[PDB]
Amino acid sequence: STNTFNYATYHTLDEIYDFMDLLVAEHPQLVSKLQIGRSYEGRPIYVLKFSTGGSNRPAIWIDLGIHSREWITQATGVWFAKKFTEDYGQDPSFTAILDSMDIFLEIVTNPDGFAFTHSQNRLWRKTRSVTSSSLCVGVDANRNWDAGFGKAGASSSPCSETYHGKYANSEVEVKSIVDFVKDHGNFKAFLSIHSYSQLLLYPYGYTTQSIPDKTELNQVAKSAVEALKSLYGTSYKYGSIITTIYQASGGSIDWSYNQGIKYSFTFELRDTGRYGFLLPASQIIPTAQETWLGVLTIMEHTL
Ligand code: NA
Ligand SMILES: [Zn+2]
Numbered sequence: 001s002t003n004t005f006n007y008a009t010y011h012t013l014d015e016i017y018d019f020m021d022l023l024v025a026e027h028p029q030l031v032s033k034l035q036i037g038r039s040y041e042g043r044p045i046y047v048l049k050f051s052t053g054g055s056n057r058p059a060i061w062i063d064l065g066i067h068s069r070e071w072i073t074q075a076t077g078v079w080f081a082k083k084f085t086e087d088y089g090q091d092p093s094f095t096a097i098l099d100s101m102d103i104f105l106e107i108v109t110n111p112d113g114f115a116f117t118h119s120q121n122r123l124w125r126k127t128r129s130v131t132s133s134s135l136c137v138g139v140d141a142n143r144n145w146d147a148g149f150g151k152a153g154a155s156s157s158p159c160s161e162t163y164h165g166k167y168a169n170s171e172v173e174v175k176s177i178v179d180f181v182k183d184h185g186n187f188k189a190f191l192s193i194h195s196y197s198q199l200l201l202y203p204y205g206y207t208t209q210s211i212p213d214k215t216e217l218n219q220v221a222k223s224a225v226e227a228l229k230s231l232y233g234t235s236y237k238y239g240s241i242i243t244t245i246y247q248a249s250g251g252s253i254d255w256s257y258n259q260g261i262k263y264s265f266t267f268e269l270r271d272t273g274r275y276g277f278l279l280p281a282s283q284i285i286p287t288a289q290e291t292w293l294g295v296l297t298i299m300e301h302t303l
Contacts, residue, residue: 037176068113077107079288139165147254148206153247190256205241205248
């Protein structure tokens, strides 16, 4: 069951997908498993929908593991999924959120990459799409979105780990999300979960121009990082992608924000570089716990 599932170890794709099935079997009135598309290599792409009912009500999007090597993110997503089912009807604030909004949680946004990080290359970042006139494989799915696509902050080289692909939305992993979010039509928050560096970022990455909601999003981010820090003292910086991490084009939250999804943020989880991508499994639960407080804070503001 999801009660005896080990949340304190890193899991395989099959184990995470199996976890989804268990959670849905245990909580059919709250959680459903949606298939939003197929990966390049033909693996199902799964989103968990958390809903108390209503008619096409406003929604929160959360993607994790778009960059496959960032194992702390998929691990945090599994923890999140369980947490939602525990806290609904128990925590007044989360109850209020799920009473007015649906949450769509995509734990493994890049399943081909995730498989590849277990089988061949632990540090694999990109998708696994074949590039026609190249010996190199894959596209950076977080450089592939239709928001300043192909501008500075991505590579045009197929062998680069920040290769943007031939055109915006070329990667089915990205197109599946775009289609789903657009078809739904009523997303109010869009949160992309990455690692590492302990940052909470808002748009833009592709341009130095500040967003018109900078004051509000900056305050939300400030509040969220203070909530996060309250648990273990984990210090996060916050600000726009471009001013806080680097210039990056074709990124997810730049796209989502441009769709009018005001509360668009990217988390960069633990750590700052001591362990980096190879954050030990004993850090999964404390990371997920503190990150939850930050995410909940954003959800409260979206509410
Ligand atoms: Na795997
Ligand atoms: Zn990333």
